[PDB]
Amino acid sequence: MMIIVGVDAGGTKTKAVAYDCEGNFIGEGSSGPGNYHNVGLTRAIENIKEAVKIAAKGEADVVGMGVAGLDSKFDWENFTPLASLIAPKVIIQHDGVIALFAETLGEPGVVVIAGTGSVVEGYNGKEFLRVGGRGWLLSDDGSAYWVGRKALRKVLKMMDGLENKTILYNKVLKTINVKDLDELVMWSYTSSCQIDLVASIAKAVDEAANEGDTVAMDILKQGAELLASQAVYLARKIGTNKVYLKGGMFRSNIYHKFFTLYLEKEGIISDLGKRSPEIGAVILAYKEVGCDIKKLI
């Protein structure tokens, strides 16, 4: 039969699931990061290949992959030529695209992915579209990173006495394990360009907001609305009144509420994601080769 493998090549790991063309599961596999910016081009390719081989228990006939790190034509040019060696037929898209297909099952739609970074991905039946998702410095509005940065800056002002200290102050310090301005400054000397670390602070903001801290509540509001406006823009551009929401930021009740209130006022319906990215990659492959998605899901 035809062995089809869906792959989610991420920043920390690569996960793959193999199915035949009749919706039957074959196996699954995992390997290191598939994002070449993190482990180099060759290592990234090898990891994707490893995951695919484990899942397929040998060679695969078709491989659909959602890859993180392809944020510029230059990335695609560097990656595509080698990724194509993985199998006789390989379909390559952004990691956000398979996350979208996991929910739309290959049909048009828009998905908001708000985790460490943020992005709004869309598909209109022919072209794939995107807004945001270009990194922590240039973009990523309302991501965990964006939230943590705002929190850090607010805490500094409290330390300066410009504003009174709120629950947020200790929550943040607890997260990065610093007890005062002196340790915070020292912390910035070696951690300022530590993306994951800054992003981890979003959890402290959520905790503070739940406990009644309006300063924390306001940060979530601003981030959520900034990202939600982008979601509305793409949804309107694609022609759908429903968007899917995915990512760690949505684990925050207050963040999710501000986000949905914004969408609702704009006439947009939303649904939290319920399928895995890799399944969306298998769907990406099914669409390309002609296997019935109905037998799969």
Ligand X SMILES: Nc1ncnc2c1ncn2[C@@H]1O[C@H](COP(=O)(O)OP(=O)(O)O)[C@@H](O)[C@H]1O
**Of ligand X, its own copies, none, which one sits near residue 144, judging by CB under 5 to 8 A according to partner kind?**
ligand X
- The reply, when asked if residue 12 is annotated as ligand binding, is yes
Closest CA to 52 of 67, 62, 42, 38: 62
What distance lies between CA 104 and its chain's CA centroid?
16
* Phi-psi map region of 54: left, alpha, beta (phi>0 left; psi -120 to 50 alpha): alpha
CB of 14 to its own copies, least distance (A): 21
Site string for its own copies, 57-86 (x = CB under 8 A): --------------xxxx------------
Query: Do 130 and 238 touch, CB atoms closer than 8 A?
Result: no
Q: How many residues does the chain have?
A: 297
Backbone dihedral angles phi then psi of residue 156, each to the nearest 5 degrees: -60, -45
Among 160, 177, 190, 274, binds its own copies (CB under 8 A): 160
**Does 290 show up as a binding residue in the annotation?**
no
179 annotated among ligand-binding-site residues = no
Q: Does residue 190 bind its own copies (CB under 8 A)?
A: no
Smallest distance from its own copies to CB 16, Å: 27
Beta pairing, strands 25-31 & 14-19? antiparallel
Q: Is 196 helix (H, G, I), strand (E, B) or coil?
A: helix
Q: Would the annotation count 11 as a binding residue?
A: yes
Residue at token pair 């035809």:
2
Kindly state whether residue 152 participates in binding its own copies, applying the rule CB under 8 A: yes
Q: Which is nearer to ligand X, 210 or 229 (CB)?
A: 210
List the one residue from 13, 43, 89, 134 that touches its own copies (CB under 8 A): 134
The smaller minimum CB distance to ligand X, of residues 141 and 206, is found at 206
Contact residues for ligand X (CB under 6 A)? 115-116, 144, 199-200, 202-203, 206, 247-249, 251-252
Q: What is the C-alpha separation between 29 and 62, in angstroms, rounded?
A: 16
Separation between Cα atoms, residue 55 and residue 45, nearest integer Å = 16
Q: Which residues bind its own copies (CB under 8 A)?
A: 37, 71-74, 130-132, 134-139, 149, 152-153, 156, 160-162, 181-186, 188-189, 192-193, 198, 229-230, 233, 237
